[PDB]
Every structure is written in structure tokens, then in C-alpha cells.
Amino acid sequence: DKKSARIRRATRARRKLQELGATRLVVHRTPRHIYAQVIAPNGSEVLVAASTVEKAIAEQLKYTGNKDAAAAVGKAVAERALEKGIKDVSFDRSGFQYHGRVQALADAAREAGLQF
Amino acid sequence: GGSTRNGRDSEAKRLGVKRFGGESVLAGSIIVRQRGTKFHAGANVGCGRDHTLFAKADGKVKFEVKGPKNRKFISIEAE
Amino acid sequence: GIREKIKLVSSAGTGHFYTTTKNKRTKPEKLELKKFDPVVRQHVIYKEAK
Amino acid sequence: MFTINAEVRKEQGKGASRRLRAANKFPAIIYGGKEAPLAIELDHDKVMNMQAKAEFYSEVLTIVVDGKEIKVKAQDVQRHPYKPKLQHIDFVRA
Amino acid sequence: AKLHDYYKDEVVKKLMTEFNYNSVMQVPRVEKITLNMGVGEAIADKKLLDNAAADLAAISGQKPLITKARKSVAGFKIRQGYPIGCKVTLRGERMWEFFERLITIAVPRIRDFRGLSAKSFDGRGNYSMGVREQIIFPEIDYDKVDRVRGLDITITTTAKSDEEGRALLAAFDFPFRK
Amino acid sequence: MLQPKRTKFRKMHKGRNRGLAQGTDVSFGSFGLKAVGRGRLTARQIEAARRAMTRAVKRQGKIWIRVFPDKPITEKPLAVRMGKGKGNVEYWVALIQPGKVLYEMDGVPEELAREAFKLAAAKLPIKTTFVTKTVM
RNA sequence: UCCUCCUAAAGAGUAACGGAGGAGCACGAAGGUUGGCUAAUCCUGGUCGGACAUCAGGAGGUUAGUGCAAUGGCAUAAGCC
RNA sequence: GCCUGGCGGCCGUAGCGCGGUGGUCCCACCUGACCCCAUGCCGAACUCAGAAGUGAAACGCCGUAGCGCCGAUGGUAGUGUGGGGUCUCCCCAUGCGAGAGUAGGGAACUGCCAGGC
């Protein structure tokens, strides 16, 4: 299963970030959408979320789940994170590669001010 | 014939006992020989080399069973 | 005891050296590594053997 | 019919059970899955003769405790390992 | 063109019109078919790569997989695994092209099948084809190598074909017209 | 007979004999030779009691042997001193606790089974008793 | 002399000319990191492939593997690229 | 209130099997691939760009105990202390008290955020 293989790829870095007590900006990637979630180091509550399925993000984009959509979602999640006042998060690939939409989301968060 | 040979070790078990106020780096479980009977997850990650579990903060030892595999973990919690 | 002891001599002109083991039957080439030279306080090439 | 007169157990444990077996009685338990189990003691020779009667396990038995008739059925029998005698019976409520 | 045949025929008119069946995702789909070679313990051969790379680079410019062992367990003295086979699993448009060229060599000319080709019988879903006769070669030299298309080609098939199989389409060997 | 075909280890520690036996019920047959008392049942004694049984029933019915000689017993040779390693394995025993059904019998009348069990009990060292299959 | 298991009594330790086995190395990659991956075995169709060489499918789940004895490990793999 | 996705808590009362159910909300298969990138060949997978199609497979939910799993009460085994028969093993007072079985339970529960109705 592709999702199970992705979880097996993600698990090492997820436990490593759990042991460091790092606030994790996790990304979820689908063919249709992309999701970003800044989650507190306890792992149970989500501080900041920005999704492509949100209508305010999705109305400005020509296609949901694009690299431009990933840049918009990364800029939005970094804007809400800096509005909340939290900084110095660690990026979680969640089993994906650092390539394409995941890389674009992280680059947009770095450009908008979320430092890793 | 002959078969009388043997090796030596002089400790193989835990020293921290879940009330034990271990400071700094005390070996909570030295010569466990292996990271699988006890894992270190409370005060960061212990288990340096020969898998000796050691404290990383001044505090009480904590023994616990977590995970899907029912594995035993040593934690250090502050007093 | 097929492996024999060799030196690794700093290329930074100092007399500093490391020591290691090597077997010339399988690795007859000379071993070159970037190692720290504490006299120069920099990482330099270490190649030369005894 | 298979009626056994039984008494309730004042004390439970290995010492009390061995005292019963020294006084030529033996413990037993009744459970039904609907209410609390009842610990009883039985007259060993009488329940032995009912063991030797071969229809003891098939049909429904009647245990009388305090004048109350309880319809039971023998689930398992703990027997002494090398003597004919028997140590413990558990009865399921029928 | 066989991909266009699969998209076009047997599906879209009659069962869509009269009596509905559920899904074109439910009807069986031809996945990646494969071909394998089986050479011996000799390493010095280049003929295996020559034939497989010829069948691949008649259109492409790529090379086959030189496979050592999936199992990595050897009854010989060297357990590690010598390179003793080739793999080409066929791919998409080139898969349909290779399947179409196999059909247009084997089917319309009665050359290969003398008698009943099915002799070893068991049930569970395997169709490997080993011709052992050189059917086609892209170069002008038709047959100069030691191998005679002894390679196996694997098609996975639930060999039943029940409804229109036992209705009209059995298999056998009378070329007819309209 | 009745020595195991393979063993993981050639020799064992002497050990001590347990409290009470598992396998007190008559399971496969209809009659049984239960053990009353501790001891070690040598493979030769097991074979001798089996032959006495089988000839007493005239090779009719079916006989189960519920115990197996899986413990090797070492003995030092004559006129050798103490030490110098453990002795050589000589014979195989089965450790018997009170209540162990040693043998089982079916397909015979009860009195013929009792006669065969008595002739086997005369060969066994430990005290035995006759038991019958009981439903629980 | 050194290592592993049991003896050894659920902390450590613990003897015998007690019961079993190994070591006196190897590796400039078989170390580091990053990215990726998952075995043994069994049932089937095909080129000397035959019972076991290589494919493809299914079952199974670590019964594999660890440079080398044994023990404890190991999937977040410390196993493979 | 219902459904879906993400991150957890707890780790077989949590899973497997069998049967049913869901769709351009969401998610999966799916379309194409020169280009951002990859296959010791493999647009299988990893990726990227996304007109159509179906939920078939997967996944989610529900029912079913067939298998896993949990599991009493009572008894038994063992054992600390004291005492007693003992040839190698037990008994009594007292304290602790299993494992396996039995009745039974069991088709998880819950927290945060986001989306549609």
C-alpha cells in the first residue's frame, strides 16, 4: 500500500521530531489538493492549519493541487503562524520527497517568514 | 574431552529503579547489551554505544510500556 | 595479521601523522583522506605511509 | 433427581480447603453469568456415590443451600491425582 | 493501435445500451506484460543483451535489466548471485506496440501451432509463452544468434473466458471471412 | 528401545522430581495404568511392561504408552576416580510423579485389561493402580 | 588469556578436571550521512531450469538476514541498494 | 447532527475473515508526460501537468463470533516465616498466591484542526 509505505518513510523523522520536542509543520499531498499543518510538540493539538480545500485559498488558484497552489498554501500557513506569533518550526516531509509541491510549500513558508 | 571455559561480565541489569533520582548522565540500564529490552525516550534519546541507557536531565527514572509493539521505555522526569 | 600498520602524514608541512591499518594484497593503492591537522587547525590531505 | 445438600463457605483458601478435605468434605463453586458466584462445600462420600452413578453429568442437578433449590449442571471435576477421591466441582446454572 | 482497440471495442455500445454492467474499471485490464531470459552460469555472453537491447532499441535507445537473483539464494559455491538473466517488462504504449507486433507476427500466418500446445495442466492463472522459434527480428540478419526466441513472455490471465468464450469465441484454427 | 532419535544436547543435569503429574486423565483408551508414587521409569522397564501387556492381551486391542524416556542418565565406569568430566550416557528414563497415567488400553474386556496391567505393574518399580476412563 | 549460554537460587556476583561452543581477526568500506527498499518458505505456467538458476501471480509475515561462535536485539530497521 | 481528510492518545475487548454499503464534497484508482525529476529497463514506484471515467481494486463505515484477543469466581501448583513426618519427598498454622482451563466479555474508545451537507 502506497499510504502504508509513505507512513513507513515518515515514521523515522516523525519520532525524531517527537523526541526533540519540535513544533512540526507537516504537509499532506494529494493529486487534488495540498495541506499544511503546524502542530504543537505534544502532537495532539493543531496550532495552525492552511488547506487547499479552504475556499479562500482555493478561489485564487487556477487549479488546486498545483505548485502555485502549494506556494499559496505555504505562504498562507506562514502568514497565520506569524500572526499567531510562533516561530522556529521544523518541517516534516510526511513520507514525501522534498520535491515539487512539498519543496514549493516549504520554500514559500521560508520566504513568507517561517524559519526552519 | 574438555569444555570448561567461560567469559566474564560484572553487571548486566538496570541501576535506576523508577524512584531513583538520577542526575546528569547516570547509566539507568548499563550492559543491557541491546536497545530492545529498554529504550530511552523521556530525556531525549540515550543509548549511546553498547546501548547503555543513560539519563540526560536531573530527575526521577520512569519505566513505561508504550508503542504498538509493547516495548519497555526508560524515561527521566523532573522532581 | 594480514593487515599491517601504516601512517598517514599531513600534507600541510607539519610532522603530525595518524596511524591505521591496511592490507596491501587487496588495497595496494595509497590511502588518502582529509583529516584534521591540529598544528594547522584545519582539515588537510593525509596520504603518506611508512 | 440428583439433589445435593450443600453448605456455604465461611472461609476460602488452600488451608480451609485442605481442612475440608481432612474433615471429609470438599469445596465447590456455582456460577451462572447473571449473578455473583456462590462458594459451597459438599459431603464427599455422597457426591462420590453420585459420581459413580454415570448420569451425573448429562442432566440437571438440584443443590439445596439454606432450603433454597438451585438448578445446576456439573461443568468440570477436579479429581485427586492418584486416589479415587475428588477435590472440587464447578457448577454452571442451568 | 491495440490500445485504441481496447478503448474502442467490446464495451461501449451494446452493454451500455440494453443491459447495464457496472464498471469499465471492473472489466479486466491488461497491465504490464513481461519478458525474461534465462542464461546459464556463463558471464562472458553478450548475445542476451544483444537480442533484448535489439528488441528494445528497434524503437528506443535503452537497455534491458541484467538480473542476478530475486531470491539471492544459490545452490552453487557463490551464494551472492551471478547475472544470469535479462528482464524487459513492457511499458504502456510500447507494451501495446509489442503485444500488437506479437499478434501480427503469430496470428495471421499459420506457422507455429502444429498440434495441441496445452499439455501441462493446472488451474491458477498463468500464461507464459516460449516459442523456441525465431518469429521476428528487426535487423536484416534474421537469425544469427544462439537464441531462437526461447525466452518466456508472461501474460497473466484468468483463463475462463466464460460468457462470450463459450458463446462464440473458443480459440481454434480455422481462418474464415465475412 | 524408546530412546529419542535426536537430542539438542547430549547430557542433562540431574534435577529433582516434581510435585504432581500432568496427564492424570484417561484420554485415548478406556483403561489405564496410573502411577502412585515417584520414581524414574527406565526405557528397559517400559519395554518389559509393554511386552507383558501385549502378550497378556495376545496382541489384541490397542495399547498407548503415555510416557517417554527423554532424560539421559550418565554413569561413571568402574575403577575411575571422581571428576575428570561428566560420565558417559548409559540409559534413558522418564520422570514419574504420582498420578501419571503410564499406559492406556482399549478394545479388551476390563478383567483382561486388569490382568495385563497387573503383569505390567509387576515389572514396573513404582506402585501403580488401575483407572478407568471418566467423563467430566 | 579473552568472548557467549546454562549451572546461578527472577538485582549484581558466584565454584568444579561441570555441560556446550568460539576468539588472537576483518572492513577506507563492511565507517558517516541522505534518499530509497523489505525477507525465509510453499503452490503454479516456460530455453539444457532438473526437486532447487531467471520471470509473473498468490499464500505467509521475519519462520529471513546480521563479515565470523552464542545470547540479547533489530521494521523508526542496527537487514538490502 | 452526519460524512471525509490530517495529526495524535491507547496499543489485538483495537486485528483478520465473511457479507453489505460510499462518490468530478473528501480520498483513491484514473488522463498525459518531451518538460521539475526517476527507473542499475521499468511515468510499476517517485514526480509533474490535469480535459473525461468509475468507485471496480484500495480505503472508510455497518452487520456477523468463525478465528485471533481479553477474561473472572472457586480450586490447584508454588513459596516467605515458624513447627512436624522425612531415607531421595511431603504435612500443619499463617501470609502471599499463579499458569492452564471455566462462566463470560468482545465487531474499540477518545482529543485537536480543516472541508462538504
Coordinates of N, CA, C and O in Angstrom, one line a residue, chain E residues 8-9 25 34 38 40 54 59 63 80 92 103 128 132-133 169 172:
Chain E
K8 N -11.8 1.0 -27.8 CA -13.0 1.1 -28.7 C -14.0 0.0 -28.4 O -15.1 0.2 -28.1
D9 N -13.5 -1.3 -28.7 CA -14.4 -2.4 -29.0 C -14.8 -3.1 -27.7 O -14.1 -3.0 -26.7
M25 N -13.8 0.2 -15.0 CA -12.8 -0.1 -14.0 C -12.9 -1.5 -13.4 O -11.9 -2.0 -12.8
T34 N 5.3 -9.1 -19.4 CA 6.8 -9.1 -19.2 C 7.5 -10.1 -20.1 O 6.8 -11.0 -20.6
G38 N 16.9 -16.5 -19.6 CA 17.3 -17.5 -18.6 C 18.7 -18.1 -18.7 O 18.8 -19.3 -18.7
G40 N 22.8 -19.3 -18.6 CA 23.4 -20.1 -17.7 C 24.4 -19.4 -16.8 O 24.4 -18.1 -16.7
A54 N 18.2 -5.2 -28.8 CA 17.7 -5.1 -30.2 C 16.2 -4.9 -30.2 O 15.7 -4.0 -30.9
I59 N 13.0 0.7 -31.5 CA 12.3 1.9 -31.4 C 13.0 2.8 -30.4 O 13.2 4.0 -30.7
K63 N 18.5 0.0 -22.5 CA 19.0 -1.3 -22.3 C 18.1 -2.1 -21.4 O 17.4 -1.6 -20.5
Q80 N 26.2 -15.2 -3.7 CA 25.8 -13.8 -3.9 C 24.9 -13.6 -5.1 O 24.0 -12.8 -5.0
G92 N 3.3 0.6 -21.2 CA 2.3 1.5 -21.8 C 2.1 1.4 -23.3 O 1.6 0.3 -23.8
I103 N 1.1 -10.2 -32.0 CA -0.2 -10.7 -32.7 C 0.0 -10.7 -34.2 O -0.3 -11.7 -34.9
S128 N 2.5 -18.3 -19.6 CA 3.9 -17.9 -20.2 C 4.0 -18.6 -21.5 O 3.5 -19.7 -21.8
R132 N 10.4 -20.9 -28.8 CA 11.6 -21.6 -29.3 C 11.8 -21.6 -30.8 O 12.5 -22.5 -31.3
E133 N 11.2 -20.7 -31.5 CA 11.3 -20.5 -32.9 C 11.3 -19.0 -33.2 O 10.5 -18.2 -32.6
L169 N -16.4 -17.6 -29.1 CA -15.0 -17.3 -29.3 C -14.2 -18.4 -28.5 O -13.8 -18.2 -27.4
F172 N -10.0 -21.8 -32.0 CA -9.2 -22.7 -32.7 C -9.3 -22.6 -34.3 O -10.4 -23.0 -34.9

